[PDB]
Amino acid sequence: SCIQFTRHASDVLLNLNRLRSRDILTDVVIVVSREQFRAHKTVLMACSGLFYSIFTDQLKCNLSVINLDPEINPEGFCILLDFMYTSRLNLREGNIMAVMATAMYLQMEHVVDTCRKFIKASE
Amino acid sequence: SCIQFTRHASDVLLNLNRLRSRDILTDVVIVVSREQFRAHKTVLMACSGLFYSIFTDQLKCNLSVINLDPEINPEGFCILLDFMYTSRLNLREGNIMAVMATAMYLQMEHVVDTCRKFIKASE
Amino acid sequence: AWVIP
Amino acid sequence: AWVIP
Ligand SMILES: CCNc1cc(=O)[nH]c2ccc(Nc3ccnc(Cl)c3C#N)cc12
Ligand SMILES: CCNc1cc(=O)[nH]c2ccc(Nc3ccnc(Cl)c3C#N)cc12
Ligand SMILES: [Cl-]
Ligand SMILES: [Cl-]
């Protein structure tokens, strides 16, 4: 018998991104080839199969720093982190290969899907 | 130049609610007349003016337990906590007064708005 | 906003 | 789903 407020989920995400901007209650640093990105473990888990596996592990859930594979591109990661917190993906000819490789590693299937479609269209 | 994945925000909220169900990375207990509710501080802050003020305070941000005013109804709080994590509000004739009073205390304006409208319609 | 889901 | 926002 519930009623639903259409904008609620987007408003929550907007506020989570504002907390990230303001570095409020961020609880992990993701290190990508020495570039560092502060984030909230719960948002990362909610968006990525890799982070869901990492932060549900009984030892890794307590880590304050996570180092990604050295082959991961920091710009690709930055673009995906922004997508996690905003639903908007800054996909460009110059970054699509890195974004797709990063999304495959992070296990973000919808992103991998749109990257494949954009690449196939340019062939 | 971004593209946007329409369902992303709702999918993130669905996953945050799954973490809450499974008590994964919950970091606060809200006590309402001895009833206890586990939650994520970031979701509470993202949904409520009261929790935003509490968890941005330099001392209160570190508390693992928050006690609400004794006049707050635990069922009203439970209904609002479910709304925070799902966008669905279980508003019924038997709970609307408690839900509205709780939403006013929690500073959730959209909820206070729909409660006022539903009450005005029954007058 | 509010709707019947 | 993907759209132009
Ligand atoms: C918003 C997009 N999300 C994902 C996209 C994707 O392509 N793959 C995902 C794998 C896992 C998760 N996260 C969960 C999956 C199932 N249960 C829980 Cl409790 C979580 C959490 N937290 C999320 C995604
Ligand atoms: C999703 C609905 N949210 C709210 C509803 C409401 O009626 N009142 C609100 C007061 C405050 C906040 N939270 C914020 C406000 C501004 N900046 C930041 Cl960083 C946060 C956070 N976190 C949220 C709400
Ligand atoms: Cl995705
Ligand atoms: Cl609200």
Q: Where are the domains of chain A?
A: 1-123
User: What residues form DSSP beta bridges with B6?
Assistant: none
Say if residues B90 and A1 touch (Cβ distance below 8 Å): yes
Query: Which chain B residues in 64-93 lie under 8 Å from chain A, judged by CB atoms?
Result: 83-84, 87-92
Inter-axis angle of helices B8-21 and A8-21, nearest 10: 80
Tokens in use for B56?
């941005």
Distance CA B72, CA B98 (A): 8
Helix A74-86 / helix A8-21 crossing angle, nearest 10 deg:
140
The answer to whether the CB of B60 falls within 8 A of the CB of B85 is no
Quick check: B41 and B60 in contact, CB under 8 A?
Answer: no
Is there a contact between C5 and B114 if contact means CB atoms under 8 Å apart?
no
Q: Which A residues in the span 61-90 are in contact with D, Cβ-Cβ below 8 Å?
A: 88-89
B-C Cβ pairs (cutoff 8 Å, strict): 4
Question: How many angstroms separate the CA atoms of B71 and B82, rounded?
Answer: 20
CB contact burial A57-94 (16+ within 10 A = b; e otherwise): eeeeeeeeebebeeebbbebbbbbbbbbbbbbbbbeee
How many angstroms separate the CA of residue C3 from the nearest CA in chain B? 9
**Amino acid identity at A2:** C
Residue type, A49: G
How far is B99 from B84, CA to CA, in rounded Å?
13
CA A34, A39, A42, A45 torsion-angle sign = negative
Q: Does A6 touch chain C (CB under 8 A)?
A: yes
CA B29 from centroid of its chain's CA atoms: 13
CB neighbour class for B36 (10 Å; exposed up to 12, middle 13-18, buried from 19): exposed
3-state secondary structure of C2: coil
Q: Which of A5, A38, A84, A118 has the most B C-beta neighbours within 10 Å, making it the best mutation to test the interface with B?
A: A5
In degrees and rounded to multiples of 5, residue A71 shows phi and psi of -80, -10
Distance separating alpha carbons of residues A92 and A26, to the nearest angstrom: 29
Q: Which of A51, A58, A123, A47 has the alpha carbon at shortest distance from A89? A: A47
How is residue A93 annotated by DSSP?
A: T
User: How buried is C5 (Cβ within 10 angstroms: 0-12 exposed, 13-18 middle, 19+ buried)?
Assistant: exposed
Resolution of the model in angstroms: 1.5
Atom of ligand 1 nearest to the CA of A109: 7
| Tokens describing residue A77 | 């990661």
All partners of chain D with 3 or more CB pairs under 8 angstroms: A, B
C-beta separation of A55 from A41 below 8 A: yes
CA dihedral over B62, B55, A51, B89, signed as positive or negative: positive
Hey, what amino acid is at A54? I
Ligand nearest the Cα atom of residue B52 = 2
CB of B122 less than 8 A from some CB of A: no
Angle B8-B17-A99 from CA coordinates, rounded to 5°: 30
- Is A16–B47 a contact, with Cβ atoms under 8 angstroms apart? no
Experiment type? X-ray
Q: Residues 6 or more apart from A35 whose CB is under 8 A from it? A: A74, A77, A78
DSSP one-letter string for B1-58? --EE-TTHHHHHHHHHHHHHHTT-S--EEEEETTEEEEE-HHHHHHH-HHHHHHHHST
Nearest CA in chain D to A114: D2
Rg of chain A on CA atoms, in Å: 15
- The separation between CA B66 and the C-alpha centre of its own chain, rounded to angstroms, equals 14
Distance from the alpha carbon of residue A113 to the mean position of ligand 3, in angstroms:
9
